Amino acid sequence: SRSESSIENFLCRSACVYYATYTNNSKKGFAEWVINTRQVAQLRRKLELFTYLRFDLELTFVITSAQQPSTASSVDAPVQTHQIMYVPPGGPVPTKVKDYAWQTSTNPSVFWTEGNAPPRMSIPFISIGNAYSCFYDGWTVYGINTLNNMGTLYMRHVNEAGQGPIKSTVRIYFKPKHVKAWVPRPPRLCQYEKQKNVNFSPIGVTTSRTDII
Amino acid sequence: DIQMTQTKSSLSASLGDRVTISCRASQDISNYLNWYQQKPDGSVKLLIYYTSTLHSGVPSRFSGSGSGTDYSLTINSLEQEDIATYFCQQGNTFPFTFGGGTKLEIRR
Amino acid sequence: RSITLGNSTITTQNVVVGYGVWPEYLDQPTQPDVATCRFYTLESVQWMKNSAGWWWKLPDALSQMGLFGQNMQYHYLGRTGYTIHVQCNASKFHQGCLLVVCVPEAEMGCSNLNNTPEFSELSGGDSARMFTDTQVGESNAKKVQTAVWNAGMGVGVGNLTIFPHQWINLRTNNSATLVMPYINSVPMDNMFRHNNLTLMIIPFVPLNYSEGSSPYVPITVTIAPMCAEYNGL
Amino acid sequence: RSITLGNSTITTQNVVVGYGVWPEYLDQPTQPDVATCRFYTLESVQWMKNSAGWWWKLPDALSQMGLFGQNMQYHYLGRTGYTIHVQCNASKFHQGCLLVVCVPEAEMGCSNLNNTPEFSELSGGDSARMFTDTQVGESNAKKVQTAVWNAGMGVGVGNLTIFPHQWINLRTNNSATLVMPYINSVPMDNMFRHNNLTLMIIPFVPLNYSEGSSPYVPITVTIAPMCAEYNGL
Amino acid sequence: FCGSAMATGKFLLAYSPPGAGVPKNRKDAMLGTHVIWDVGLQSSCVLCVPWISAAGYVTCWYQTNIVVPADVQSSCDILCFVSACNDFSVRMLKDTPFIRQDTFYQ
DSSP states (O other): OOSTTSHHHHHOOOEEEEEEEEESSSSSOOEEEEOOSOSSHHHHHHHTTEEEEEEEEEEEEEEEEEEOOOOSSOOOOOOOEEEEEEEOTTOOOOSSSSOTTSSOSSSOEEEEETTSOOOOEEEOOOOSSSSEESOOOBBOOBSOOTTOOOOEEEEEEOOOOSSSOEEEEEEEEEEEEEEEEEEEOOOBOSOOOOSSSOOOOOOOSSOOOSOOO | OOOOBOSOOEEEOOTTOOEEEEEEOSSOOOSOEEEEEEOTTSOEEEEESSSSOBOTTOOTTEEEEEETTEEEEEESSOOGGGOSEEEEEEOSSSSOOBOOOOEEEOOO | OOEEETTEEEOOOOOEETTSOOOOOOOOEEOOOTTTOSOEEOOOEEEOTTOOOEEEEHHHHTSSSTTHHHHHHHOSOOEEEEEEEEEEOOOSSOBOEEEEEEETTOOOOBSSTTSOOOHHHHOBTTBOEEOBSSOOOTTSSSOBOOBTTTTTTTBOGGGGGGSSEEEEETTTOOEEEEEEOOOOSSSSOOSSSBOOOEEEEEESSOOBOOBTBOSOEEEEEEEEEEEEEEEOO | OOEEETTEEEOOOOOEETTSOOOOOOOOEEOOOTTTOSOEEOOOEEEOTTOOOEEEEHHHHTSSSTTHHHHHHHOSOOEEEEEEEEEEOOOSSOBOEEEEEEETTOOOOBSSTTSOOOHHHHOBTTBOEEOBSSOOOTTSSSOBOOBTTTTTTTSOGGGGGGSSEEEEETTTOOEEEEEEOOOOSSSSOOSSSOOOOEEEEEESSOOBOOBTBOSOEEEEEEEEEEEEEEEOO | OBSOSSOEEEEEEOBBOBTBOOOSSHHHHHSSBEEEEETTTOSOOOOOOOOOOOOOBOOEEEEEEEEOOTTSOOOOBOOOOOOOSSOOOOOSOOOOTTOOOSSOOO
16 A cells, blocks of 8 residues: 555645626626636645756636526526636736627637536646746745746626626636656745735744643 | 825715725825735735736636835725725835725615 | 866765756757856854754855856856765764755745745855744834744745755765756756755764864865856857 | 958958967966957058158057957966058059068167167057157156157168068058067066067158149058967966 | 974965065955865975066965864974075075175185
């Protein structure tokens, strides 16, 4: 029973890393997630046992809808269709729900109607360097390392609706594939405080007892 | 110190309307704001732990916005249990400074 | 014994080498070897009783050391390995214990939870920055959190033995020797905006002596760059 | 054509080499070659109608020229050869004639018969000192006697063709090339208290042109040290 | 090093070539040619150097202090020797300036 501690069986799992809502008629409603691994505290602690990682990426989106309270008179809507646009590092970015950056050609989008299998998509290892870097002892602002940049995701409705407001949620699932890890690192003791840096507050080494014997 | 100023300190609105409470800082605090809600019996809880990110267990009637110095809190559907006092607290520099209260009541 | 490099000579009498690999070579880069391969001896730090630790950021300590500090300004990129000799000279009447780790990419934390520490607080030019045995308060804006039991990086200080390290026990040992290769994600990087190594010396068991003995023990660090090459015309 | 040396490149199209020998190599001396072997181009002098001549003391003109002027300060001794390229660019409507000699040990005379000329009057740092067509009076204390018909050394100026030389006749020729070995009585000498070469350019037939042509002809001198070695550790 | 057997320290042995100046600091003496002499390991250091008729400096610096146990004296001494490494080349014999007489010894 020695193979469940390999790097493939330790890191290649699924994890809910983001959860956001958006509606159709608010003219402010669309979602946005910059792809990182530093948001949740249980995936960050596992990926920070190593200094340099190199993995492919696989994302799955779970999209549900809910009917908001409309006025009256027999709300009857067809099936809904969503657009999940992926912006590579160094691409145009939408600011409104109706924009020219949704219709561009180098931003690969998926289109998905409700009632089917969820829309999986996969992203290869995109970097100029040869590995990602969990830790960076240097300046770009201290410890940013602009070289590991995976991009941004954007979600919206493509159906125009007038008779009934509809809001929708989305849960993004994160799964590394073909993982390679270098230069191990001790596990983090203090609690995480911020996202970008390694700031902390000092804590005791271990839980204490009443005597040495 | 950064003086968090809420210049209204009293709002009056009926049931079911949209209310907007504004909190203005002294300098740029860079999207580090929190909104708390103090019930009239004395219990305090956290509503929005960023400029616009909702805490888990909070109804979706609350929303926030703003950038730089000016910020806002929006309740589009006022309910009976939403009659409380609201504070803004920055988390940028030392020490932590809270804003003044803002009490809500019904119009007529 | 009596190893010489260029126009410098030190004397020694085991060696722990990196992650099991030796520092080796790779537009077209040039390779200087008469310019860099010599023993740069930093000044000595004094190990007293109430001491806490020291750290050196490694391509920052040799930034004003003669001709290695000139090639950092002239050439843009560069890669290098190191060979570190740490040795403290005490009698058989002193007692103590040191840990000599070499941490790759040791990103440190500020005392205020919202800021990042400034440049003069991470590394002094060829001078040792030192840990403390207390906390730094949050009222200080840009200062490194130097609680020695957390090693400045928010991690347990007993778990620092996963890095290439060596124990110096004054009962039985006197010196340490570390040979570090080039560890980075890119093959060549800028030497001013990245400090890819950090040499820490932390006393686990403190110094003790009786009355009459010398109240200090000096520690001497000697660094020699091995297999360095820069990218330029 | 298009000869390169180090990180410098000039373009050419006969060569007169020394006294028939090529510059070659010999405590122990070191030999730098990537440091010195490059074309140091001095600034251009303007050949007008009422011009008289120019001279350069040769290990003095390259005393502030980059990395050759740094090894003169660091190392005590040294020997070197040279390769001098002189070329003036005029049209087919100008006329004139130059003599390009290279005099070993050209000791010069003062204007006052009892003194010796001072250091700033023999050689300017990478700037041409110039002859005159008149006498310098004896009332001036320490000044070089620069009567051009005596060439500053008390000798006939027509007899200067016994040295390694080359004629530049604007009717048929445009450039000169001289390769000088190391000529001294000791194998290595100090480079601040001895100037063992002197490059003179003397117009025998003066420049003439019609109205409309350019009233100057620039002369460009390019020196490259060949086979240099210094004595040090 | 003519000191005790329990004392330990370190010394720099810098050498300035002819033409170069004397170092005024420990740091720029390290940047020249030097030999770090550890007293606790070896008790004798040999330093070969040319000498020809500024001409050089053989300056020496404290690297660390002398660490000593209890009931051992701290003030030590150092002797220095000189010799001829290779064979010299002496020429043109003359008389010595160190001896003269005013009237015949009797």
